[PDB]
Design a protein around this motif. Structure first.
Motif, PDB file in Angstrom:
ATOM      1  N   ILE A 102     -45.954  -9.537  48.364  1.00 33.11           N
ATOM      2  CA  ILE A 102     -44.558  -9.941  48.220  1.00 33.11           C
ATOM      3  C   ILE A 102     -43.693  -8.754  47.799  1.00 33.11           C
ATOM      4  O   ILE A 102     -42.507  -8.700  48.118  1.00 33.11           O
ATOM      5  N   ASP A 103     -44.295  -7.812  47.079  1.00 29.88           N
ATOM      6  CA  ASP A 103     -43.564  -6.639  46.621  1.00 29.88           C
ATOM      7  C   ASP A 103     -42.966  -5.895  47.803  1.00 29.88           C
ATOM      8  O   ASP A 103     -41.786  -5.556  47.810  1.00 29.88           O
ATOM      9  N   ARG A 104     -43.803  -5.636  48.788  1.00 33.70           N
ATOM     10  CA  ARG A 104     -43.375  -4.914  49.983  1.00 33.70           C
ATOM     11  C   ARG A 104     -42.010  -5.404  50.465  1.00 33.70           C
ATOM     12  O   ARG A 104     -41.311  -4.695  51.190  1.00 33.70           O
ATOM     13  N   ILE A 105     -41.630  -6.618  50.070  1.00 37.20           N
ATOM     14  CA  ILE A 105     -40.346  -7.170  50.487  1.00 37.20           C
ATOM     15  C   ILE A 105     -39.208  -6.372  49.873  1.00 37.20           C
ATOM     16  O   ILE A 105     -38.150  -6.207  50.475  1.00 37.20           O
ATOM     17  N   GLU A 106     -39.442  -5.878  48.670  1.00 36.18           N
ATOM     18  CA  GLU A 106     -38.440  -5.092  47.979  1.00 36.18           C
ATOM     19  C   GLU A 106     -38.200  -3.781  48.721  1.00 36.18           C
ATOM     20  O   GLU A 106     -37.109  -3.534  49.233  1.00 36.18           O
ATOM     21  N   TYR A 107     -39.230  -2.943  48.768  1.00 38.42           N
ATOM     22  CA  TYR A 107     -39.134  -1.652  49.443  1.00 38.42           C
ATOM     23  C   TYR A 107     -38.480  -1.798  50.816  1.00 38.42           C
ATOM     24  O   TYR A 107     -37.950  -0.833  51.363  1.00 38.42           O
ATOM     25  N   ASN A 108     -38.523  -3.006  51.367  1.00 40.85           N
ATOM     26  CA  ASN A 108     -37.930  -3.252  52.676  1.00 40.85           C
ATOM     27  C   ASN A 108     -36.444  -2.900  52.660  1.00 40.85           C
ATOM     28  O   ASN A 108     -35.864  -2.567  53.692  1.00 40.85           O
ATOM     29  N   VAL A 109     -35.841  -2.968  51.478  1.00 38.82           N
ATOM     30  CA  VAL A 109     -34.427  -2.645  51.333  1.00 38.82           C
ATOM     31  C   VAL A 109     -34.177  -1.187  51.704  1.00 38.82           C
ATOM     32  O   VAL A 109     -33.414  -0.892  52.622  1.00 38.82           O
ATOM     33  N   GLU A 110     -34.826  -0.281  50.976  1.00 37.68           N
ATOM     34  CA  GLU A 110     -34.674   1.145  51.230  1.00 37.68           C
ATOM     35  C   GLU A 110     -34.629   1.417  52.725  1.00 37.68           C
ATOM     36  O   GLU A 110     -33.877   2.277  53.185  1.00 37.68           O
ATOM     37  N   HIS A 111     -35.428   0.675  53.488  1.00 38.25           N
ATOM     38  CA  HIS A 111     -35.456   0.847  54.934  1.00 38.25           C
ATOM     39  C   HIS A 111     -34.074   0.585  55.516  1.00 38.25           C
ATOM     40  O   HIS A 111     -33.461   1.475  56.110  1.00 38.25           O
ATOM     41  N   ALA A 112     -33.589  -0.643  55.357  1.00 37.32           N
ATOM     42  CA  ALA A 112     -32.283  -1.000  55.889  1.00 37.32           C
ATOM     43  C   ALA A 112     -31.259   0.069  55.527  1.00 37.32           C
ATOM     44  O   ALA A 112     -30.651   0.674  56.408  1.00 37.32           O
ATOM     45  N   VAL A 113     -31.065   0.297  54.234  1.00 33.76           N
ATOM     46  CA  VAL A 113     -30.106   1.298  53.786  1.00 33.76           C
ATOM     47  C   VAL A 113     -30.323   2.628  54.508  1.00 33.76           C
ATOM     48  O   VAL A 113     -29.385   3.403  54.697  1.00 33.76           O
ATOM     49  N   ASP A 114     -31.566   2.892  54.895  1.00 27.22           N
ATOM     50  CA  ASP A 114     -31.897   4.138  55.583  1.00 27.22           C
ATOM     51  C   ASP A 114     -31.136   4.265  56.899  1.00 27.22           C
ATOM     52  O   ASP A 114     -30.351   5.194  57.085  1.00 27.22           O
ATOM     53  N   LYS A 147     -21.637  -2.888  51.451  1.00 21.74           N
ATOM     54  CA  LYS A 147     -21.835  -3.035  52.888  1.00 21.74           C
ATOM     55  C   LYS A 147     -23.002  -3.974  53.177  1.00 21.74           C
ATOM     56  O   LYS A 147     -22.967  -4.750  54.125  1.00 21.74           O
ATOM     57  N   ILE A 148     -24.033  -3.895  52.353  1.00 21.05           N
ATOM     58  CA  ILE A 148     -25.199  -4.748  52.538  1.00 21.05           C
ATOM     59  C   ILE A 148     -24.778  -6.211  52.611  1.00 21.05           C
ATOM     60  O   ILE A 148     -25.288  -6.981  53.423  1.00 21.05           O
ATOM     61  N   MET A 149     -23.844  -6.590  51.751  1.00 16.73           N
ATOM     62  CA  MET A 149     -23.360  -7.967  51.718  1.00 16.73           C
ATOM     63  C   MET A 149     -22.259  -8.211  52.753  1.00 16.73           C
ATOM     64  O   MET A 149     -22.072  -9.335  53.217  1.00 16.73           O
ATOM     65  N   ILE A 150     -21.502  -7.167  53.078  1.00 18.17           N
ATOM     66  CA  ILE A 150     -20.390  -7.304  54.020  1.00 18.17           C
ATOM     67  C   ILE A 150     -20.808  -7.149  55.490  1.00 18.17           C
ATOM     68  O   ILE A 150     -20.626  -8.068  56.286  1.00 18.17           O
TER      69      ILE A 150
END
Length: 109
Positions: free
Chosen positions: A51-63, A86-89
């Motif tokens: 389930i943790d891997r779900i977090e690091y998934n963020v860094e990806h998007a922002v990437d 922007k993430i929310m918008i």
């Protein structure tokens, strides 16, 4: 405006009906989150490693997004703080276009 009738225009009619659901949501949310609290406790402890891997998934998007929002917006802003909201918008706004496909996907409707 509608005044009685308004069969098809139910959306706009029921829309305001959110004022009556608000309480329902909060209430059901208490009995729901309350119990789930113990459920999520399962994947949190044991399957927490996955389930943790779900977090690091963020860094990806922002990437990629970081480079996307810079292009999409055509390039015109100040401070890198935007990348935060922007993430929310933007990233969220994109979903709006997909959500519709949902109701039509057959899942919701």
């Amino acid at each position: 405006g509608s005044h009685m009738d308004s069969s098809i225009s139910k959306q706009a009619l029921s829309e305001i009906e959110t004022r009556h659901s608000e309480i329902i949501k909060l209430e059901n949310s208490i009995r729901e989150l309350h119990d789930m609290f113990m459920d999520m406790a399962m994947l949190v402890e044991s399957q927490g490693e996955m389930i943790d891997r779900i977090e690091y998934n963020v860094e990806h998007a922002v990437d990629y997004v970081e480079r996307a929002v810079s292009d999409t917006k055509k390039a015109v802003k100040y401070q890198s703080k935007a990348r935060r909201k922007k993430i929310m918008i933007i990233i969220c706004c994109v979903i709006l276009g997909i959500i519709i496909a949902s109701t039509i996907g057959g899942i919701f409707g």
